[PDB]
Design a protein around this nucleic acid. Structure first.
Ligand code: CL
Ligand code: MN
Length: 175
DNA sequence: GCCTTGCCGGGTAA
DNA sequence: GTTCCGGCGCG
DNA sequence: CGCGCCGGAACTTACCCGGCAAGGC
């Protein structure tokens, strides 16, 4: 479906450059947040937000897309119990993504946490198990890759995509 | 040569 | 990237 | 009383970038 794909992509952005938060305030107040942060307000307004808005319309979510200016980056924020569980449940069923979703999701994760220089093809994350999942999808799409611990200061692993397959990767995934 | 990729420090964009 | 804050709405 | 959407803001740190050098054809 068109929404499952846009969903997979947004989840990549979210995991890569934002998050999902179940907040608890005093006294017994709460909030659920779907967040993507970025340096460029323009990317957020022009590229990311129209995608999220579509998803919101599609799910009859009522919350508004908030764009908040932070000291170091802009934050897209949807304050919504519904949107939150939607993405959170999807994250839990990640291993079952089909090809369409796999691709969309890797695209989102790469845009967010990849080497966009493209001189090398790399993805960074502290979650090894998440990288191992991506690694297998790639291998099965004919894109060889390795994982090792890149940054010993912060426990950040890198998924390195063999440049022998640079073309199949840039073409297949970053479409 | 040249290409690839593991290594590792800077500092800003998460 | 994450979690405080004070606000508000609502059964 | 209990919870869930707003609008920030302060707070922390995980990324991305990019030079180097070892191994391979
Ligand atoms: Cl995971
Ligand atoms: Mn990023």
């Amino acid at each position: 479906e068109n929404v499952s794909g846009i969903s997979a992509y947004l989840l990549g952005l979210i995991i890569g450059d934002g998050g999902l938060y179940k907040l608890k305030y005093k006294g017994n107040r709460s909030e659920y947040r779907v967040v993507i942060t970025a340096k460029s307000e323009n990317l957020i307004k022009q590229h990311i937000a129209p995608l999220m808005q579509f998803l919101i319309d599609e799910l009859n979510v009522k919350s508004k897309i908030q764009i908040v200016k932070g000291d170091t980056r802009y934050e897209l924020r949807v304050s919504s119990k519904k949107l939150y569980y939607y993405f959170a449940n999807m994250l839990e069923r990640i291993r079952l993504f089909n090809m369409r979703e796999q691709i969309a999701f890797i695209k989102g994760l790469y845009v967010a946490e990849g080497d966009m220089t493209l001189k090398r093809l790399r993805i960074w994350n502290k979650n090894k198990a998440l990288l191992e999942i991506v690694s297998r999808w790639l291998n099965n799409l004919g894109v060889r890759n390795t994982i090792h611990l890149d940054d010993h200061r912060h426990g950040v692993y890198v998924l390195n995509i063999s440049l022998r397959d640079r073309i199949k990767f840039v073409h297949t995934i970053l479409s």
